[PDB]
Enzyme design. Structure first.
Site, PDB file in Angstrom:
ATOM      1  N   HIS B 101       0.819  -1.218   0.000  1.00 32.73           N
ATOM      2  CA  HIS B 101       0.000   0.000   0.000  1.00 32.73           C
ATOM      3  C   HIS B 101       0.854   1.269   0.000  1.00 32.73           C
ATOM      4  CE1 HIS B 101      -3.936  -2.056   0.983  1.00 32.73           C
ATOM      5  NE2 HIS B 101      -3.066  -2.987   1.331  1.00 32.73           N
ATOM      6  N   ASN B 174     -10.006  -3.179   3.360  1.00 31.56           N
ATOM      7  CA  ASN B 174      -9.864  -3.059   1.905  1.00 31.56           C
ATOM      8  C   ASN B 174     -11.228  -2.770   1.272  1.00 31.56           C
ATOM      9  OD1 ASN B 174      -7.122  -3.464   1.683  1.00 31.56           O
ATOM     10  ND2 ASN B 174      -7.312  -5.683   1.412  1.00 31.56           N
TER      11      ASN B 174
HETATM   12  C1  HEM Z   1      -6.996  -8.839   6.013  1.00 30.94           C
HETATM   13  C2  HEM Z   1      -6.273  -8.481   4.996  1.00 30.94           C
HETATM   14  C3  HEM Z   1      -5.542  -7.229   5.062  1.00 30.94           C
HETATM   15  C4  HEM Z   1      -6.019  -5.989   4.832  1.00 30.94           C
HETATM   16  C5  HEM Z   1      -7.426  -5.641   4.482  1.00 30.94           C
HETATM   17  C6  HEM Z   1      -4.927  -5.116   5.005  1.00 30.94           C
HETATM   18  C7  HEM Z   1      -5.021  -3.753   4.843  1.00 30.94           C
HETATM   19  C8  HEM Z   1      -3.945  -2.902   4.857  1.00 30.94           C
HETATM   20  C9  HEM Z   1      -3.987  -1.552   4.512  1.00 30.94           C
HETATM   21  C10 HEM Z   1      -5.183  -0.822   4.060  1.00 30.94           C
HETATM   22  C11 HEM Z   1      -2.764  -1.059   4.649  1.00 30.94           C
HETATM   23  C12 HEM Z   1      -2.312   0.343   4.400  1.00 30.94           C
HETATM   24  C13 HEM Z   1      -2.499   1.281   5.590  1.00 30.94           C
HETATM   25  C14 HEM Z   1      -2.047   2.684   5.306  1.00 30.94           C
HETATM   26  O1  HEM Z   1      -2.641   3.423   4.595  1.00 30.94           O
HETATM   27  O2  HEM Z   1      -1.051   3.139   5.782  1.00 30.94           O
HETATM   28  C15 HEM Z   1      -1.956  -2.106   5.073  1.00 30.94           C
HETATM   29  C16 HEM Z   1      -0.629  -1.944   5.353  1.00 30.94           C
HETATM   30  C17 HEM Z   1       0.104  -3.003   5.836  1.00 30.94           C
HETATM   31  N1  HEM Z   1      -0.230  -4.272   6.105  1.00 30.94           N
HETATM   32 FE1  HEM Z   1      -2.029  -5.085   5.721  1.00 30.94          FE
HETATM   33  N2  HEM Z   1      -3.836  -5.902   5.338  1.00 30.94           N
HETATM   34  C18 HEM Z   1      -4.126  -7.083   5.386  1.00 30.94           C
HETATM   35  C19 HEM Z   1      -3.314  -8.136   5.678  1.00 30.94           C
HETATM   36  C20 HEM Z   1      -2.016  -8.034   6.095  1.00 30.94           C
HETATM   37  C21 HEM Z   1      -1.202  -9.057   6.515  1.00 30.94           C
HETATM   38  C22 HEM Z   1      -1.541 -10.498   6.615  1.00 30.94           C
HETATM   39  C23 HEM Z   1      -0.014  -8.504   6.833  1.00 30.94           C
HETATM   40  C24 HEM Z   1       1.156  -9.193   7.317  1.00 30.94           C
HETATM   41  C25 HEM Z   1       1.160  -9.698   8.493  1.00 30.94           C
HETATM   42  C26 HEM Z   1      -0.111  -7.135   6.615  1.00 30.94           C
HETATM   43  C27 HEM Z   1       0.880  -6.244   6.816  1.00 30.94           C
HETATM   44  C28 HEM Z   1       0.773  -4.920   6.466  1.00 30.94           C
HETATM   45  C29 HEM Z   1       1.891  -4.019   6.575  1.00 30.94           C
HETATM   46  C30 HEM Z   1       3.241  -4.380   7.053  1.00 30.94           C
HETATM   47  C31 HEM Z   1       1.478  -2.826   6.190  1.00 30.94           C
HETATM   48  C32 HEM Z   1       2.277  -1.570   6.120  1.00 30.94           C
HETATM   49  C33 HEM Z   1       1.926  -0.736   7.324  1.00 30.94           C
HETATM   50  C34 HEM Z   1       2.666   0.543   7.418  1.00 30.94           C
HETATM   51  O3  HEM Z   1       3.750   0.700   6.971  1.00 30.94           O
HETATM   52  O4  HEM Z   1       2.198   1.496   7.954  1.00 30.94           O
HETATM   53  N3  HEM Z   1      -1.378  -6.908   6.266  1.00 30.94           N
HETATM   54  N4  HEM Z   1      -2.796  -3.298   5.245  1.00 30.94           N
END
Ligand code: HEM
Ligand code: HEM
Ligand code: HEM
Lengths: 723, 307, 721, 83, 84
Positions: B101, B174
């Site tokens: 993202h 999402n």
């Molecule tokens: C259920 C499914 C998931 C959804 C809907 C989701 C949603 C999101 C969204 C919307 C963001 C962006 C947030 C922003 O704007 O800063 C994000 C970032 C991220 N997600 Fe997910 N995610 C999911 C699953 C996962 C999984 C399984 C992991 C790993 C364990 C993960 C790890 C991350 C990481 C590392 C970021 C970056 C966060 C940051 O740097 O601030 N996510 N996710």
């Protein structure tokens, strides 16, 4: 239970047992292309064939599909160290992108000097034609972030790392011979202005916005390099079809201590070729990786990027004999005044194995010189020398980034420096000079033994912050550039200014830029004004124009198309075909194209195979949908009754031909295929429309038309065509 | 002459006499659109009007056009602390992009509950319709790096930060109601497959490459959300015109200690609409900032996103 | 002209036409192992090499910045200067948040006999395998510049580089910890660390916030008792015990689980300093323990330890009067004995402290197949913490590519990138893949793929301290009752000196009140020392009972329960010019016969002349090496020597201090004159007097076997020294 | 040195380091950016009328005193230091 | 893995179904290794038979009788399609 087995440990084969080609790591596709740097990198490579999946500590993993939980349907336990190690590493994969030139692509190769330059420089890598100096090269845009598109309108960056025996030499250039500003202290201002704007971060990969033109209209030193990037120079067809420039004046010192002023050039063996703006923009849409993919595949196809290294050589006493300062990086040295002496050749012949390890982590800096070369008093260059080491302290995580494998020199490098983050070397001797406890090793090297020494240039003046009066000349070279262009090239320049200014919201910025243009040339100013709805005042068309430069009004070398060659080899051609195509014609077209090093790609309404009218199966390179005309240099349609009728019911297929036409490209039509051209609102065949029935003879004349690069005379009628 | 003046310190006005509207900071265009969070942020804002250009140490700069040199044509001096401070800061402007993202856009607003949900949860921000709970939302794509285009075929992220009196609550969802994988240990594998491939970093912003579909083919649990992203759900028309989903089942606990299983949804007041693939591909060419621009202009025009 | 040359480039030899401490590769290159061999590729040899920039460019003048003239302004174009200063400016990385102060060494481990009956762990399978180790010893509170011989817990981290994975045994030098649940760790550390307003005090728990926290958290008292004892001031890292503390699991090839606790028992005995001596030593040699370990490896007195295990079958987990999952409980060796199963030898110092010791990264989550975790809630929180901390300490997630941290077995996976990525991968970065036939592949458990033992899990999601954890005083009482009387006194000394530096009197009274629940004599003695009147209800607080019928455990006492080794100890030989040369020779040869090191301290360095005219090489001055740095003191005869020493306040004070520190003092002939002239009581069992040097030294060595003259301690408190 | 010790180029925004006078300029971003800027981030600019603006020396804008500079580019210890 | 994909497919209008077909065909048409396309198409025969056929048509993939007879999942708590 086979659905179940997918979510269980995978202990069995996964490839199809039989075990055209996908792009691959360079070790897999061109292992025979070698040099000393690549060999050094081999110790860091891995061959996982037959190996257990493991933690970073070397513990074998039994189950890479499931977290450790309180049951099959329970809570995840904190004690799952495998989970956390895997997710931790993932979480910290990204490092900061470069502050400029974030979008880039790299390749390995070698350089060879044609004959010793010992008369001009002691630089080792220029003394011996028998040596193959390893290089790494990173090409790049300037403004966009790392995921931005390739074929934007921008300066291209061109960084060459020479791994020499006497040190690593970084030649850090661009594809135009000048830069936008004269003093390093303006660089963050100019960059901030061109970058996306700070409130909304819009626009990406584009200088067509208010703050950039605002800066331009107030800093007329920028006008020369603005002229270059508004020209077709700003949209190169390939990193292999563009010129390269160190920009700054450097010094070379020979073994007697005599000093020559120099400037570096790269001249492409594959010629200088650009896109046209409409085509470049569409290409950002359907292949944002175009340049990067093209460079990668040309090396896999053996169309190796080749370039000759050139030097303009000015003895020290001719420094002040020009109608500009050679210390001024907004000024070029006309090739008609000082010729470019071709002194060597570089060939990029091997792609990386891992883009991040090699291309993302490589660090260039103009500060990285070698004995035999030295700096001039170019005030932009001087400030550059500080930034490249500094920025890398955070980009690459500290002061030990020279120990990252791609950055390592291939000669020794002992010193008294120690520690820092991620220290890889282990030192067991005295960490200070002079010492006696280790007999003062490593030891200073005298100059006659190749120790670096600065040439003792005189230095006289007062400490001051003041622009040199020899620099106040903002318009003479923008005019020289403009007068050197063909009319087609001048129209694209006018088109660049007009399209970019048309996205500038504040009218007075547009007005002030057009005003600047009235100091370069009146036709240029007037034509841009019209496209923008600006009525110029009588006084503005009376604005004085700069005179000639050392007897020159123009310089043929400044024009892409009148001054440089077009090469056929390496170009791409779309062969439009559906089921029922003539198998013989495809055979003979494909063979003729390859006889000239041109790549034919069959695009059909589906992938896999199409069957010829002879009932034979022809492998398809992709769909017409997926590979629009902006991706190829020319288009040919073979015969076959059922193929042509299929394509006439295909809006994509028909638009292919209209679009290729509007983009001034060669179109070849065999037999009934001309009935497909007739049905479109395109005029009578011009000199870039080739029709015949014998497929070999047609392919030959087609290839001969593609030698013109683009059909410029067609530009006027293509403006009315609706596509 | 005035060509000389452009490379000398600029002490005189530069705006034209006179003094359809360009995008501008939210503080200049909608200063009346307020909430507590925005008010907290006011104290970190600047008013440069009339102010001198200074170093970060507060020292007035007289000449922002020239390095300090040994004469007007000389060598730059190490003692130019102004130059080196200016260039140092610029050299270190960048920070790592999000690992997924990376490409996204954000806006401020506020949330109100319709009526107390005390029957299901003690959550403060779901008790009182009179509370104006500040939010900040970041919409995003998933695969592409921070410079990649807006109208790609991809999942869209939708993260809402609720600044509540009893804590910051993030709803990180999402624009489709399911995800690709079942267990978090597979996330690096799935992300690596969909991302640009490791040797060449191709392709940007697209799942149309071998490694992604290699993973899908071998991991059928992914088929459901793949169905979603191959539909036109994967190319929304605007962030104002897509649905949002927490995807996971959570739990709400009321004051009696009764637990309900709960799933979060956002339903757009401006409806659910999508581009068509060919138009979405062409938009990445002519406006890679389309969704970012659209959201920003829609707010500036009083077509406020409402969900 | 020659002064001129010192500020011009140095192109000529500077080397001149007992030995110092040197890098391990210089001093013990013949001591090797698989890990040291791996490290060789990263070693450098600048002999005969030019001084160069980091890009390989030779430097001609390492003495001057590039200027506008010999007296001019430094130029920004001097990249040599700027690269040199820049590397210097960024040398420092963060210190460890705890155990910042430490010291490291290489060695190897050998299992005595296969432990296949209890575990599948590869490094415990084959007595012929030499498994490399790296060990870091540390204190806990102090920052990296703090002193070695403070009063503190000592950390003890051993990295076993095994053929099936790197295993880290991260323990301490006491068998219990201060707290039960990891969530409290930052509270406890903040309390013990220097207080946040003034960052005072360094390397000491003797301040208000530590004792405040102790006084509110009785679970801490057990380990407090250990650190208030002389266990808190080891003589040497070679002479302390070591413990993993937590109960781990061991899984054999059948899948049978044994509960396990790790131990190190030192071959050189268990010996400690005394408080006054320790504190003086932080003054005159803040690097005492590091130097001593470095020099013991160079001497050949290689650190040796036997790995022990207490082995508890799964079905015996609930048969004790304490939770084996409670990290504030120990398992008394009288109930569960320690089986010695292997031996560690430390035999090579590093070449570069920063590259190896500073950058090494340990974590208890770094297990290997055959070992598993228990539900000990301290240990569970530790598993998260070690990897996370190293993200910032070592600058990212590739710290395992730092050479000291690399396994010696393969480590293929699908992880990529991160800051300072060394590896260059060219195959599929996702599992499952087909484009590379899914290599690297998951390993079946029967092939060595790690699996977790399927322990049952039944309960409710909750935040609650297990009721079986709520026992705070029985083990402190057992440890108290197991000490000798001299050891009990030093415990009382520890509490009283530390609480003496607590400003808020209610904190001291609250700690003393806690003590009344352990032993009334202990509380009373501390209270008296602090001017605290104990109420009668306090004197009558109820005391815990025996633990599984146990009220003492001899192994809990350093001096009654463990051995004292004469070998490797240090003896100061005080001598000036005019010393009897044959006496020195005879003392030296005798000391050497028992493995003891004799150090000649004289009023000046260089050599002294004996009355026989021979020259004798001096080990240092008296003033530079005070009595706290040696185990015993001997003074040889020689009229001019004795007379010189009697004119020397330091030499006289050397004898007074060693006396008060309960150390053996040998006096030959006229040397007794020196003792007699001092304000000292008459010779006791630890004042060996003789005329024959060889005889005297043999007797002097025999007295050393006792470590200290404990009976002297009463009169020692009246000595003015 | 402070770029790594204090975590980046915004260590001037750490409270103890902040000046007590104004400090507007065109610097932006960097790790842990506290201040929120909303005006043009380049100089010269017209969209915000070139504010913040350079300050004339007679207004207190820093200037280097024009000391004469005469010599040759060289690495050499001044003879006058050899005592 | 397949009931909810099938439920999604059957809830789509005909236009929406065509666009889903276009998605797979366009994306899978940039996949170079043929066995990957064929395996993806093989997964689609467990979701819907027409979907698999329309996409395999655009990829030059002939479906087998064994594949065209692959079992499809049953309804979800009585539900075969949901308007939302
Ligand atoms: C259920 C499914 C998931 C959804 C809907 C989701 C949603 C999101 C969204 C919307 C963001 C962006 C947030 C922003 O704007 O800063 C994000 C970032 C991220 N997600 Fe997910 N995610 C999911 C699953 C996962 C999984 C399984 C992991 C790993 C364990 C993960 C790890 C991350 C990481 C590392 C970021 C970056 C966060 C940051 O740097 O601030 N996510 N996710
Ligand atoms: C002569 C005009 C200049 C040219 C031709 C030039 C060229 C380049 C090129 C090609 C790169 C990208 C190298 C790569 O990684 O592949 C680059 C990066 C950079 N340049 Fe320039 N530059 C110029 C002027 C400046 C100036 C005036 C500054 C500021 C002092 C500057 C600062 C930087 C920085 C900070 C980077 C990023 C370096 C990194 O992250 O490794 N450059 N330049
Ligand atoms: C039985 C109790 C514990 C023992 C015996 C123990 C032991 C140690 C030792 C010996 C070290 C130093 C390792 C080295 O030389 O590098 C250390 C470091 C450390 N421990 Fe503990 N510890 C314990 C409990 C805890 C707890 C509860 C935490 C927090 C959850 C913790 C967090 C740390 C951290 C963060 C480090 C620094 C690691 C590094 O920077 O490399 N430990 N521990």
């Amino acid at each position: 239970n086979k659905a179940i087995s997918t979510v269980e440990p995978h202990y069995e084969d996964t490839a199809p047992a039989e075990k055209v080609e996908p792009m691959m790591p360079g070790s897999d596709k061109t292992p025979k292309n070698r040099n000393e740097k690549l060999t050094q990198l081999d110790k860091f490579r891995f061959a996982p064939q037959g190996e257990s999946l493991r933690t970073n500590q070397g513990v074998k993993i039994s189950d890479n599909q499931n977290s450790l939980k309180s049951g099959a349907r329970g809570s995840t336990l904190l004690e799952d160290f495998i989970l956390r190690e895997k997710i931790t590493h993932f979480d910290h994969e990204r490092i900061p992108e470069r502050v400029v030139h974030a979008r880039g692509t790299g390749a390995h190769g070698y350089f060879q000097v044609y004959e010793s330059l010992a008369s001009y420089t002691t630089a080792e890598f220029l003394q011996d034609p028998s040596v193959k100096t390893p290089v790494f090269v990173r090409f790049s845009t300037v403004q966009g972030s790392r995921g931005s598109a390739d074929t934007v309108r921008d300066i291209r960056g061109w960084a060459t790392k020479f791994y020499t025996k006497e040190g690593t030499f970084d030649l850090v250039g661009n594809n135009t011979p000048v830069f936008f500003i004269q003093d390093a202290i303006k660089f963050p201002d100019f960059v901030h202005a061109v970058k996306p704007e700070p409130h909304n971060e819009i626009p990406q990969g584009q200088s067509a916005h208010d703050t950039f033109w605002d800066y331009i209209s107030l800093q007329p030193e920028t006008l020369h390099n603005v002229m270059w990037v508004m020209s077709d120079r700003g949209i190169p067809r390939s990193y292999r079809m563009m010129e390269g420039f160190g920009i700054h004046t450097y010094k070379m010192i020979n073994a007697e201590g005599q000093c020559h002023f120099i400037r570096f050039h790269w001249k492409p063996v594959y010629g200088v070729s650009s896109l046209i703006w409409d085509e470049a923009q569409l290409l950002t849409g359907c292949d944002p990786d175009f340049h990067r993919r093209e460079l990668w595949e040309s090396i896999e196809a053996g169309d190796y990027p080749e370039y000759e290294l050139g030097l303009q050589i000015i003895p020290e006493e001719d420094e002040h004999k020009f109608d500009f300062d050679i210390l001024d990086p907004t000024k070029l040295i006309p090739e008609s005044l000082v010729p470019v002496h071709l002194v060597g050749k570089m060939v990029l012949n091997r792609n990386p194995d891992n883009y991040f390890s090699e291309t993302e982590q490589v660090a260039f800096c103009p500060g990285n010189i070698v004995p035999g070369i030295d700096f001039s008093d170019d005030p932009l260059l001087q400030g550059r020398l500080f930034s490249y080491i500094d920025t890398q302290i955070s980009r690459l995580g500290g002061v030990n980034f020279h120990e990252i494998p791609i950055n390592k020199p291939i000669c020794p490098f002992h010193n008294h420096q120690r520690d820092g983050m991620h220290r890889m070397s282990i030192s067991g001797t005295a960490n200070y000079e002079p010492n006696s406890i280790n007999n003062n090793w490593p030891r200073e090297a005298p100059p006659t033994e190749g120790g670096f020494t600065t040439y003792p240039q005189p230095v006289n003046g007062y400490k001051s912050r003041k622009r040199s009066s020899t620099f106040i000349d903002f318009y003479s070279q923008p005019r020289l550039f403009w007068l050197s262009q063909t009319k087609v090239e001048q129209n694209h320049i006018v088109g660049g200014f007009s399209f970019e200014l048309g996205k500038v919201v504040r009218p007075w910025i547009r007005e002030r830029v057009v005003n600047q243009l009235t100091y370069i040339d009146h036709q240029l100013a007037q034509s841009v004004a019209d496209n923008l709805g600006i009525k110029l005042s009588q006084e503005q068309l009376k604005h004085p124009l700069p005179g000639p430069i050392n007897g020159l009004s123009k310089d043929r070398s400044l024009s892409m198309y009148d001054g440089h060659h077009q090469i056929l080899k390496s170009r791409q051609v779309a062969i439009l075909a559906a089921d029922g195509v003539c198998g013989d014609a495809i055979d003979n077209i494909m063979k003729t194209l390859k006889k000239y090093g041109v790549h034919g790609k069959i695009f059909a309404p589906h992938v896999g195979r199409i069957t010829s009218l002879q009932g034979n199966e022809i492998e398809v390179n992709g769909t017409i949908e997926g590979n629009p005309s902006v991706m190829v240099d020319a288009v040919i349609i073979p015969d076959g009754e059922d193929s042509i009728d299929s394509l006439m019911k295909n809006g994509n297929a028909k638009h292919y031909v209209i679009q290729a036409f509007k983009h001034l490209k060669a179109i070849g039509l065999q037999g009934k295929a001309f009935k497909l051209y007739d049905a479109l609102p395109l005029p009578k065949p011009d000199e870039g429309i080739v029709v015949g029935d014998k497929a070999a003879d047609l392919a030959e004349a087609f290839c001969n038309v593609m030698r013109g690069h683009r059909i410029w005379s067609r530009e006027s009628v293509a403006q009315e065509i609706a596509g």
